UniProtKB/TrEMBL annotation, chain B:
SMART domains: Ribosomal_S15. One of the primary rRNA binding proteins, it binds directly to 16S rRNA where it helps nucleate assembly of the platform of the 30S subunit by binding and bridging several RNA helices of the 16S rRNA. Forms an intersubunit bridge (bridge B4) with the 23S rRNA of the 50S subunit in the ribosome. This is Small ribosomal subunit protein uS15. CDD domains: Ribosomal_S15p_S13e. Part of the 30S ribosomal subunit. Forms a bridge to the 50S subunit in the 70S ribosome, contacting the 23S rRNA. GO terms for molecular function: rRNA binding; structural constituent of ribosome.
TrEMBL record, chain C:
Keywords: Ribonucleoprotein, Ribosomal protein, RNA-binding, rRNA-binding. The keyword Phosphoprotein does not apply. Part of the 30S ribosomal subunit. Forms a tight heterodimer with protein bS6. Coiled coil: none annotated. Belongs to the bacterial ribosomal protein bS18 family. This is Small ribosomal subunit protein bS18. It comes from the Bacteria. Binds as a heterodimer with protein bS6 to the central domain of the 16S rRNA, where it helps stabilize the platform of the 30S subunit. The chain holds residues 14 to 77 of 79 of the full protein. GO terms for biological process: translation.
Automatic annotation (TrEMBL), chain D:
Keywords: Ribonucleoprotein, Ribosomal protein, RNA-binding, rRNA-binding. The gene is rpsE. InterPro entries: Ribosomal_Su5_D2-typ_SF, Ribosomal_uS5, Ribosomal_uS5_bac-type, Ribosomal_uS5_C, Ribosomal_uS5_N, Ribosomal_uS5_N_CS, Ribsml_uS5_D2-typ_fold_subgr. Part of the 30S ribosomal subunit. Contacts proteins S4 and S8. This is Small ribosomal subunit protein uS5. Residues 9-72 form the S5 DRBM domain. It comes from Bacillus subtilis. One of its GO terms (biological process) is translation. One of its GO terms (cellular component) is cytoplasm.
UniProtKB/TrEMBL annotation, chain E:
It comes from Bacillus subtilis. GO terms for cellular component: cytoplasm; ribonucleoprotein complex; ribosome. Belongs to the universal ribosomal protein uS8 family. Keywords: Ribonucleoprotein, Ribosomal protein, RNA-binding, rRNA-binding. One of the primary rRNA binding proteins, it binds directly to 16S rRNA central domain where it helps coordinate assembly of the platform of the 30S subunit. This is Small ribosomal subunit protein uS8. Part of the 30S ribosomal subunit. Contacts proteins S5 and S12.
RNA sequence: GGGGAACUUGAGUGCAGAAGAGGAGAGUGGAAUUCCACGUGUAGCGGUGAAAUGCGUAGAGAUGUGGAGGAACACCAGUGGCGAAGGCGACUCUCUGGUCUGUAACUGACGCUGAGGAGCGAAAGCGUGGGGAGCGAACAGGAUUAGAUACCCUGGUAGUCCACGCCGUAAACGAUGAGUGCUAAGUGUUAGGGGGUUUCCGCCCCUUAGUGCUGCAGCUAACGCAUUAAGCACUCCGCCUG
């Protein structure tokens, strides 16, 4: 869309003074110019993600909002890269070596429960081993195939997710992502003004991310 | 109340609509000091009015210094008829 | 949460009229505060002054 | 802007510092140490580490040093201009000394400056005399120095009118 | 009560630089007017222009921020304070920040800045250093 | 501009009722003041006992005065053995 | 800097309003406490961790009438309001100070600070004459204790109170001197003003001056401060140098 999907904005004007200083006064949507600047912004992010993904880099997808987490999860699936859906455990990329030597345990134990000798004690180890798979895989999610550090990020709510954005800022990852009206712009390289309440449009906006990253390769 | 000040301003009338004239101001000042003085003599320890007394007398005297600096002639013809030193 | 005096825009108290002060005084004789009355701030002081002059004038009782 | 560890970098230990913890069983003894690293031409960092023993303590410090570096501008083997160091009662004066004068500095400031490889510089300690606040103040200092060409760029001018 | 208009305007534009205003207003006088055009000549500022009213005028400045969101302005300093004036000889004009800094000086041949003042051998009170 | 409210004890014949209210009005109008309004309340049960009377007589006299009659009325009322209580209020 | 002619924003005067435990003086009211007289009334009251000293058959405590007296103003009451500070809460009156909003009807820089100087200045204390209900240093007794000049109990003097002088000090604190200008926002709250709604009931948006709490930038050793700066600057005073 060049039109508003569910872009009605934010309810309460408890918000952050950064870029919203003199935008025209029509309603509680005091920042109504976001409607007309979003289109040029997402297309600029579109071409930028196009050439970086055409170079051969890897994006991954982080979001723990209760309405968009599975939406971006499935989007990561059929776009063909990595994701974080549930709990962002502390320091994934600045702990990359420790995280991959923990994910090695998951790969080994899933291949053991796939084709290995399942039984040496067919209750006393198999039952909590079978638990331990989904136990780590819950908070882990789409961390099963990095083997290499990803060179870009997209976030739905950097307000909720301080840990990932600060970790990326320390690890000079270019952070991209949408900005709810309470969030803070300049710590993110390319910001896209988007209301977090748009539970329907929150997937379409990053669907417009996904077809770009799909078109970049082929 | 306000009758004495009205007659004082229209007697110290210089310009057609002057209230900002220094000669106008010190007249209302003088009546304020005298009203407060015969107030204080019957109420000696009204210190919170002694303070206003000191404020207005200081305002009076330094604006008098201003008037001396401006033109001492009109100062003289004010002082002789208002009668103080 | 409703201020009686702004609700009908009534001006100054006129202390001789009493029946509103009757239902602004507690039955044991004390003033109901703003937590139960919910009047505007600038009228509560003229209210308590009014019931004070009523109490000195002996139309409203000190204790009951 | 982060400079990787592709270069060769010299290290120099300046201080091993005894640290302690009091616990129910008694006093518990630990070792902090800070080191400064860099190259002789333009890049310098420092690193801190805590461990129970000296070699892996300075090893932790030296990996943190490999993590953090900062570039120093260098106009004719000396600093360009005036700069005072400033961090937390750490005040270090740096003055663009003339050539052939060598390094004139106190202990830790010389330890970072010679590891920066600057030929002619002179300085003074005006803040406190704890070494970590020294080095932090000095690198805050050399962080502030700018070349002439980019200042001319900000001016919309050239370098000739700014050197003269 | 406001003692030095130069100091008032000086720290006002310093304060706006440190907070990234593009807009800034300065109540007008002749002295800060030609200091405005001197700064416009030296390019520390995008544009300055004047509008007038019944109260001594009012001037506005559009302040630069370079190409990548960086401070073109790295500090300002008043020297010729009131209560303590300072004067320097024509040969003792200080090369502030050894060239990259710029000093503004009121001289007997009008007010000029540091380099042309030294070139034409003028001298006087050093008024403000900008770094 | 001063509104007056005073009480006389009920055990009084109407011959003396008119007498006291009239002489107090003459006091007010003879001390240079003018009566801008009079009102009456008659009988009203008091909020409390004062001396031995459960009851009292209420009366309203509205006077525009130059602040000379009210103090002397105050001393007359408080020296008078028939008035129990009274006040004077600036109506603004 | 000196002199001369300007101007109105700084500072002010008028005009229209608003709020206030601001102050001095006078008068008035109520609840209790104490004491006294009497009626009823028996044998305890009171007090503490236990207790004891005290008061009570000479009728106490309890209880109701009726007085005497001095004290402070319940509820209102609010990190509310006023004052420069100390501070100021019952009501009524006289006199009197100050603050804030609008207004540009008038002056045209009359401004800021302030050594010395002058004046105010909690409580305790001092002088003279009053007053003395309760409270209550000193002191008395009874407890506690190894001891207890104390903590505890029952009393209790000076004072506390008034008038007029004097002392001139406090953790007299925001442990932050006064004035001026600039710098993200959010949220109460006091007293005002303006606009659209209606000029009602009350809704919204501005708006000055305060008054609280959050919170950027910046600053600090840290705590933290943050348009009521401990930020940015300028003026003037006071002060420090283990």
């Amino acid at each position: 869309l060049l039109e508003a999907g569910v872009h009605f904005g934010h309810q309460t004007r408890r918000w952050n003074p950064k870029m919203k200083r003199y935008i025209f006064t029509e309603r509680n949507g005091i920042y109504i110019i976001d409607l007309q600047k979003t289109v040029k912004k997402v297309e600029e992010a579109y071409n930028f993600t196009k050439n970086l993904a055409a170079e051969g880099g890897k994006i991954l997808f982080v979001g723990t909002k209760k309405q968009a987490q599975d939406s971006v999860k499935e989007e990561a699936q059929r776009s063909g890269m990595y994701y974080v859906n549930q709990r962002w455990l502390g320091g994934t990329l600045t702990n990359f070596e420790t995280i991959q030597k923990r994910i090695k345990r998951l790969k080994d134990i899933e291949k053991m429960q796939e084709n290995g000798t399942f039984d040496v004690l067919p209750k006393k180890e198999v039952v909590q081993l079978k638990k331990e798979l989904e136990r780590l895989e819950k908070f882990l999610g789409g961390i099963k195939d990095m083997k290499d550090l990803p060179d870009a990020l997209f976030i739905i709510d950097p307000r909720k997710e301080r840990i990932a954005v600060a970790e990326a800022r320390k690890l000079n990852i270019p952070i991209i992502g949408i900005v709810d009206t309470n969030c803070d712009p300049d710590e993110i390289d390319v910001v896209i003004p988007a209301n977090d309440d748009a539970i329907r449009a929150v997937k379409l906006l990053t669907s417009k991310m996904a077809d770009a990253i799909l078109e970049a390769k082929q | 109340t306000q009758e004495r000040k009205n007659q004082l301003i229209n007697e110290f009338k210089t310009h057609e609509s002057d209230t900002g004239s220094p000669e106008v101001q010190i007249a209302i000042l003088t009546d304020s000091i005298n009203n407060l003085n015969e107030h204080l003599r019957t109420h000696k320890k009204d210190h919170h009015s002694r303070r206003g007394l000191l404020k207005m007398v200081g305002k009076r005297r330094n604006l008098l210094t201003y008037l001396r600096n401006k033109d001492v002639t009109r100062y003289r013809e004010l002082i002789n008829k208002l009668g103080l030193r | 949460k409703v201020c009686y005096f702004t609700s009908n825009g009534i001006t100054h108290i006129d202390y001789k009229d009493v029946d509103l002060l009757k239902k602004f005084v507690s039955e044991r004789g004390k003033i109901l505060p703003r937590r139960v009355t919910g009047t505007n701030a600038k009228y509560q002081r003229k209210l308590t002054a009014a019931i004070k002059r009523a109490r000195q004038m002996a139309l409203l009782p000190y204790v009951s | 802007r982060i400079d990787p560890s592709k270069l060769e970098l010299e290290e120099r230990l300046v201080t091993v510092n005894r640290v302690a913890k009091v616990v129910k069983g008694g006093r518990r003894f630990r070792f902090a140490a800070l080191v400064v690293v860099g190259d002789k031409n333009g890049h310098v960092g420092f690193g801190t580490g805590k461990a129970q023993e000296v070699p892996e303590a300075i090893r932790k410090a030296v990996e943190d040093a490999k993590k953090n570096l900062i570039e120093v501008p260098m106009v004719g083997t000396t600093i360009p201009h005036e700069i005072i160091g400033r961090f937390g009662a750490g005040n270090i004066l740096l003055k663009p000394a003339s050539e052939g004068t060598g390094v004139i500095a106190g202990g830790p400031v010389r330890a970072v400056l010679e590891l920066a490889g600057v030929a002619d510089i002179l300085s003074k300690s005006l803040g406190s005399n704890t070494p970590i606040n020294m080095i932090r103040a000095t690198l805050q200092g050399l962080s502030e120095l700018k070349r002439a060409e980019d200042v001319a760029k900000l001016r919309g001018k050239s370098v000739e009118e700014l050197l003269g | 009560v406001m003692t030095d208009p130069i100091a008032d305007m000086l720290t006002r534009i310093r304060n706006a630089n440190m907070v990234r205003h593009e807009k800034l207003e300065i109540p007008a006088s002749k002295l800060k007017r030609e200091i405005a055009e001197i700064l416009k000549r030296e390019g520390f500022i995008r544009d300055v222009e004047f509008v007038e009213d019944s109260k001594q005028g009012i001037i506005r400045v559009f302040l630069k921020y370079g190409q990548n969101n960086e401070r073109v302005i790295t500090g300002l300093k008043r020297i010729s304070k009131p209560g303590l004036r300072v004067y320097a000889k024509s040969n003792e004009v200080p090369r502030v920040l050894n060239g990259l800094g710029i000093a503004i000086i009121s001289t007997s041949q009008g007010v000029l800045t540091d380099k042309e003042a030294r070139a034409k051998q003028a001298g006087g009170e050093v008024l403000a250093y900008v770094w | 501009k001063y509104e007056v409210m005073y009480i006389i004890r009920p055990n009084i014949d109407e011959e003396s009722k008119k007498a006291v209210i009239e002489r107090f009005n003459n006091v007010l109008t003879s001390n240079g003041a003018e009566i801008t309004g009079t009102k009456d309340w008659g009988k009203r049960r008091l909020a409390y006992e004062i001396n031995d009377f459960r009851d009292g007589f209420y009366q309203i006299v509205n006077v525009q005065s130059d602040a000379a009659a009210v103090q002397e009325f105050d001393r007359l009322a408080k020296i008078s053995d028939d008035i129990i209580r009274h006040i004077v209020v600036k109506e603004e």
